[PDB]
Backbone:
């Protein structure tokens, strides 16, 4: 797949060493190369060139620290390569550098290539590799930037990374789940790769923690700053622009709050102290950010502005807040949102230069807080908050919320300025808030569901999940991991013996949560891709329905209208999405009339459309579809069948099942007991159900359990995609004991055999995956899927 660079053989030779040495000497007479070197010599890392190379050359593992923008990411790789080339051994270099995000790997590779007077990829010295996109460099004497997900995928093809000579783990402070896994895998690999060199780099790092973890490996600090960046706290921001607004650590904040205000009145005007007193800790003040942006463009010198917001809802709100003003309507401004859910083509536009009279304003999430360098950025506005997932071990409920930024994230955000020229960073938290921020975010492995952790451990054949936990830098609790094992068994991704099923193999290859991965996989298998990807896109992110202040009743009636007779919150989103695409074909004014009439968010709908393309790419790289288009005819033969779609929904949401009792309707969920239906759902006032079963995705606990989104489902969908099957008594079938319904006992025998055929189908798909040819009709794989579909259609 994406392992072309990996599965090459590292074959150094002296003749290619001489060609690289001569080419390097020829570069030193090229004007463009010479001018780039003038810029490189200004970086603090350039002064450490001999010291950095000598340490990497004498030690297997090296921890490199340095100030933001000191040059690690773009220079250290070049220092290793150019040192080898100058020593006459350049062909022995196969340097791989990991980046946490795709926008980092692309832009850094393009920048390094330009610093070497070369294009990126094209068999030159530098290139990049990401999911389904690559610019690959030459075989020997080369640098490859990639994502950590790429390296994890490589470990499935070569657990030893045999052809790589240097692996550079960058931004290691970003303790994301995959990075911690990769870091532990690299540590185990050292003894099996005595020839491999490992470099660990971060600008904001407890470097002794990583040194100690890697056997007290040597540390080296790159001293110096590139350009000064002035910092401002909330009181300083309010003082400068004269702005007037139109768990235990919080107890400390409240205790020190009155004394802090007193000490503040001695250093700031009373107006600003009163404003600090009434500022809101719950959400980011978008009006203040807009007012600060107005002040910068009207009173400060030229330079792009970069704004950090928690999520997409804040970005679009601020964007509309600016665009509603006459000043920002003109072509003197180019306002660019930046979100990880945007297509990579859209993310790269942030790096395009602006005309001299044009001010660039980038509104980004934490996607932009590390690695990347934006040329004209001079002003950084730090909203002070960051989206974080959190996990509670009392119920299967994980929450994503906007938390206070840590000091490391703040330093990384400040570091986006001061790279090519001086800059200013504005932090929207007061000084008392600053003293109570944490140094780093809690590692993601300690606060998220761990289903992907267990799938990753199993697909990489790393051994027992207990032994691997003991090797992690920060191991999660056993109960959290055991809870993930149980969830993966209920999804039938693991069998009773904690071993990957055929389905579990494909789910581990899909870079999404297995509930979503199982849904889009069977949407591709059952040829109903487009409606399922729309449902999957809305289960991730959010649904596109909004409720203005009112008068929720008229918005309710619109939602039930879009549901038709489906009794499905998820088919409602599909109908709302399909009507939106058709409204767009009519015209822009009529598209707005559609969104206003049905209380739909065009911004959310466009975001959902982007995510559908990303899901199809995942299925394309996994071999289950033939193109990146979610509406490919080859994947949508059954896209108009509500029963088949609802089965795929059930395939994804099981075991989140609810039972309906009548006479007056009551709902039960085995784990929570009696639940209720969220008033936003279309099934709140429903008393007529064709079936007594619902599937759901989101649960909200407010002293009462509400199912946010649910669809009625036939017991035969639960029978096939459920758990254990038992026949009771006096002729009933049971699914996981509690799901009981009267049915001929031989149906249970049929489902056991069809499940087995489905496993055989997925097993044959493991080696070389190709999409099911739904035009063959007379094929084994199509006959199996048709038999399952026939069972779903009729009892
Ligand atoms: N696309 C670019 N345009 C202009 N200058 C750049 C670009 N990319 C990097 N630089 C310069 O090269 C330096 C290298 O940055 P980087 O290697 O990312 O440093 P670090 O990894 O320490 O943050 C930056 O400080 C910046 O000044
Ligand atoms: F150290 Al950086 F972007 F990686 F400032």
Residues:
């Amino acid at each position: 797949r994406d392992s072309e660079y990996l599965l090459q053989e590292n074959e150094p030779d002296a003749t290619l060493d001489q060609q690289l040495l001569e080419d390097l000497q020829k570069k030193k007479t090229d004007l463009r190369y010479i001018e780039m070197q003038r810029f490189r010599e200004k970086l603090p890392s350039y002064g450490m060139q001999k010291e950095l190379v000598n340490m990497i050359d004498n030690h297997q593992v090296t921890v490199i620290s340095g100030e933001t923008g000191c040059g690690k990411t773009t220079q250290v790789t070049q220092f290793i390569l150019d040192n080898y080339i100058e020593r006459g051994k350049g062909s022995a270099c196969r340097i791989v550098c990991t980046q946490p995000r795709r926008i980092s790997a692309i832009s850094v590779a393009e920048r390094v290539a330009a610093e070497r007077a070369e294009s990126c990829g094209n068999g030159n010295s530098t290139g990049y590799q990401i999911r389904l996109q690559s610019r690959l460099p030459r075989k020997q004497g080369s640098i490859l930037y990639c994502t950590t997900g790429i390296i994890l995928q490589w470990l499935q093809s070569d657990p030893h990374l045999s052809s790589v000579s240097h692996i550079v783990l960058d931004e290691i402070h970003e303790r994301n789940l995959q990075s911690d896994v990769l870091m532990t895998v690299v540590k185990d690999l050292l003894s099996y790769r005595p020839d491999l060199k490992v470099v660990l780099m971060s600008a904001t790092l407890n470097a002794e923690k990583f040194s100690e973890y890697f056997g007290n490996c040597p540390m080296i600090h790159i001293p110096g700053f590139t350009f000064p960046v002035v910092e401002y706290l909330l009181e300083d921001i309010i003082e400068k622009i004269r702005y007037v607004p139109e768990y235990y650590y919080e107890a400390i904040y409240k205790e020190r709050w009155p004394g802090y205000l007193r000490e503040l009145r001695q250093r700031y005007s009373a107006s600003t102290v009163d404003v600090v007193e009434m500022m809101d800790d719950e959400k980011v003040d978008l009006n203040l950010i807009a007012a600060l942006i107005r002040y910068i463009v009207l009173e400060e010198e030229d330079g792009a502005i970069l704004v950090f917001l928690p999520g997409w809802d804040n970005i679009s709100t601020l964007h509309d807040l600016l665009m509603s003003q006459v000043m920002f309507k003109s072509d003197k401004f180019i306002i660019i949102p930046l979100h990880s859910l945007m297509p990579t083509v859209n993310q790269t536009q942030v790096f395009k230069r602006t005309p001299p009279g044009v001010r660039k304003i980038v509104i980004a999430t934490n996607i932009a807080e590390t690695s990347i360098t934006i040329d004209d950025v001079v002003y950084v506005i730090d909203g002070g908050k960051i989206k974080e997932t959190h996990f509670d071990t009392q119920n299967n409920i994980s929450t994503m919320s906007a938390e206070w930024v840590s000091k490391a994230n703040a330093k990384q955000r400040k570091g986006r300025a001061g790279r090519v020229q001086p800059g200013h960073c504005y932090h929207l938290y007061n000084s008392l808030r600053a003293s109570l921020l944490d140094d780093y975010q809690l590692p993601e492995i300690l606060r998220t569901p761990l289903e992907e952790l267990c799938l990753q451990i199993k697909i990489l054949r790393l051994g027992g999940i207990a032994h691997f936990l003991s090797r992690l830098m920060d191991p999660p609790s056993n109960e959290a991991v055991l809870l993930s094992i149980k969830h993966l068994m209920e999804l039938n991704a693991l069998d009773k013996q904690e071993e990957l099923t055929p389905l579990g193999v494909h789910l581990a290859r899909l870079p999404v949560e297995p509930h979503i991965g199982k849904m889009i996989l069977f949407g591709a298998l059952f040829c109903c891709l487009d409606p399922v990807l729309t449902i999957a896109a809305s289960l991730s992110f959010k649904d596109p329905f909004v409720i203005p202040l009112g008068k929720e009743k008229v918005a309710d009636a619109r939602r039930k209208e879009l549901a038709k007779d489906t009794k499905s919150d998820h088919l409602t989103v599909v109908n709302a999405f399909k009507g939106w695409e058709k409204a767009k074909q009519r015209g822009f004014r009529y598209e707005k009339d559609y969104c206003w009439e049905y209380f739909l968010s065009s911004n959310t709908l466009q975001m959902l459309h982007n995510m559908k393309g990303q899901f199809a790419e995942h299925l394309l790289g996994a071999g289950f579809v033939s193109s990146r288009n979610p509406q490919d005819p080859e994947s949508n033969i059954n896209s108009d069948n509500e029963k088949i779609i609802k089965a795929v929904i059930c395939a994804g949401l099981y075991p989140k099942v609810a039972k309906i009792r009548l006479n007056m309707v009551k709902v039960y969920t085995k784990t929570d007991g009696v639940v209720a239906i969220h008033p936003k759902s279309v099934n709140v006032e429903q008393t007529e159900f064709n079936y007594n079963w619902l599937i759901y995705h989101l649960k909200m606990r407010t002293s009462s359990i509400y199912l946010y989104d649910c669809t009625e489902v036939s017991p035969y969908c639960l029978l096939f995609f459920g758990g254990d099957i038992s026949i009771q008594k006096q002729e009933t079938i049971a699914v996981d004991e509690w799901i009981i319904f009267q049915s001929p006992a031989r149906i249970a025998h049929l489902v056991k055999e069809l499940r087995k055929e489905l496993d055989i189908l997925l097993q044959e798909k493991i080696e070389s995956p190709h999409p099911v040819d739904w035009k063959d009709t007379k094929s084994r794989d199509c006959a199996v899927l048709s038999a399952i579909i026939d069972l779903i259609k009729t009892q």
Notes: The two ends are 41 Å apart (CA to CA). Residues 43, 66, 68-75, 111, 203, 226, 373, 375, 419-420 surround adenosine-5'-diphosphate (ligand 1) (CB under 6 Å).
